[PDB]
Design brief:
With about 220 residues, chain A is mostly beta strands. The termini of chain A are far apart. In chain A, strands 2, 4, 5, 6, 9, 10 and 11 form a seven-stranded mixed β-sheet that branches. The radius of gyration of chain A is 22 Å and the shape is elongated. By secondary structure, chain B is mainly β. Chain B folds into two domains: about 100 residues, Immunoglobulin-like (Sandwich), CATH 2.60.40; about 100 residues, Immunoglobulins (Immunoglobulin-like), CATH 2.60.40.10. Chain B has two helices and 19 strands. In chain B, strand 18 and strand 19 form a beta hairpin. The termini of chain B are far apart. The chains are: A mainly beta (about 220), B mainly beta (about 210). At the A-B interface, strand 5, strand 10, strand 12, strand 13 and strand 17 of A face strand 4, strand 5, strand 10, strand 12 and strand 13 of B.
């Protein structure tokens, strides 16, 4: 199978250096251009630059020239992107992608075409915050709404279930928002018969936090 | 080169013929690609060189060009096709993408059910107060929430979050959180969120006294 495998998610502090990787399998890595593309949270796709691993010829968007270094190790079919000094605004999903070619067998590829193979993305989060478990507060109530406010944690994600997974109809768990404090917050709600008047199960893997809060 | 997509969102139904457009600010020849992306997943290439169908992509996708205007057509929309679509020019460096067109599932108007939640006394012992307004199972996505603290419009101190279209009923839900210092929270009486939505004849207000 033709694939690009990217390195795992990274949570870093500003100023730190970071190198992420993109490993090709199932094709001649040195015969195709590799591009890097950024997607900031909630935004569109932005092209950062490209490299031809066969000779390490590189081009950078003016917006990223001098902020990142793109490189390749052809001996192990891996391309890299490296920051010397991460900024908070580098928080984004980063994709590597291969450019299409009809015939890879000709030695000179010509300019980079459309991206036909995409890596699965590497999430990079840059923040001065430290790992911190959530505080969980109840959202107290024919139909009644109730919920849990999961506040002030870092980094993403938390998972939320209701009644240990037995209660799934009518549940809405909202996307986290980043607060100006630099910590995240989300809420999870469920609607239930007002006649039945409930425990939300919050897990935050980074802090090893588990909280089961009764909402009365 | 600026790539502009239109419309920004499109609501359609399974079996619809849909077209979405991409205009380049100058000639890009035919070096135009179209991509599909689903939430949290990597893009997938659909069309390259303006009209060439990527191997393995169903032929219900087609691309065409008229000058600087490029069109992506889906001839019969299927459930897998609801997604965001991006165009990209690769005529000249830097390569640039359109801002995306989200294709969503059309359904009938549904007014939101609105709920307001005061801060818990647990949280008040912490120094901050979070007031939460829930807009449940509504359609279309466009809604507005305004926070009212003793009749004074709030600005800059709320954040909101929206779910993706519900897998079963194609509605949206939204939560807005008003954040106040507990000092400011103590100094006022009435807290209200005011909800405006196409499904509502007039704005709905849920409120409480501290």
């Amino acid at each position: 199978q033709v694939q690009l495998q990217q390195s795992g998610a990274e949570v870093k502090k500003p100023g730190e250096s970071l190198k992420i990787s993109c490993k090709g399998s199932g094709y001649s890595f040195t015969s195709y251009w590799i591009g890097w593309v950024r997607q900031m949270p909630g935004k569109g796709l932005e092209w950062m630059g490209i490299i031809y691993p066969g000779d390490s010829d590189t081009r950078y968007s003016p917006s990223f020239q001098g902020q990142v270094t793109i490189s390749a190790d052809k001996s192990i079919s891996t391309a890299y992107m490296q920051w010397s000094s991460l900024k908070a605004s580098d928080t984004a999903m980063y994709y590597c992608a291969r450019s299409f070619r009809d015939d890879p067998r000709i030695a000179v590829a010509g300019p980079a075409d459309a991206f036909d193979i995409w890596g699965q993305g590497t999430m990079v989060t840059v923040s001065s915050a430290s790992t911190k478990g959530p505080s969980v507060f109840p959202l107290a109530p024919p139909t009644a709404a109730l919920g849990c406010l999961v506040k002030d944690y870092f980094p993403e994600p938390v998972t939320v279930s209701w009644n240990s997974g037995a209660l799934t109809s009518g549940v809405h768990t909202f996307p986290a928002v980043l607060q100006s404090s630099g910590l995240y917050s989300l809420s999870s709600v469920v609607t239930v018969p007002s006649s039945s008047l409930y425990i939300c199960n919050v897990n935050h893997k980074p802090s090893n936090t588990k909280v089961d809060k009764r909402v009365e | 080169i600026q790539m502009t997509q239109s419309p920004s969102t499109l609501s359609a139904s399974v079996g619809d013929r849909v077209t979405i457009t991409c205009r380049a600010s100058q000639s890009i020849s035919y070096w135009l690609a179209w991509y599909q992306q689903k939430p949290g997943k990597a893009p997938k290439l659909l069309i390259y060189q303006a009209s060439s169908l990527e191997s393995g992509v169903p032929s219900r996708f087609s691309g065409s060009e008229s000058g600087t205007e490029f069109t992506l057509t889906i001839s019969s929309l299927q459930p897998d096709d609801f997604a965001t679509y991006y165009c990209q020019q690769y005529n000249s460096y830097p390569y640039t993408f359109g801002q995306g067109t989200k294709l969503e599932i059309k359904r009938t108007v549904a007014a939101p059910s609105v709920f307001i939640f005061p801060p818990s006394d647990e949280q008040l012992k912490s120094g901050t107060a979070s007031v939460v307004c829930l807009l449940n199972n509504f359609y279309p996505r466009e809604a507005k929430v305004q926070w009212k603290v003793d009749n004074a419009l709030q600005s800059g101190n709320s954040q909101e979050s929206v779910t993706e279209q519900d897998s079963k009923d194609s509605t949206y839900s939204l939560s807005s959180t008003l954040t106040l210092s507990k000092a400011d929270y103590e100094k006022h009486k009435v807290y209200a969120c005011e909800v405006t939505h196409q499904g509502l004849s007039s704005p709905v207000t849920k409120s409480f006294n501290r």
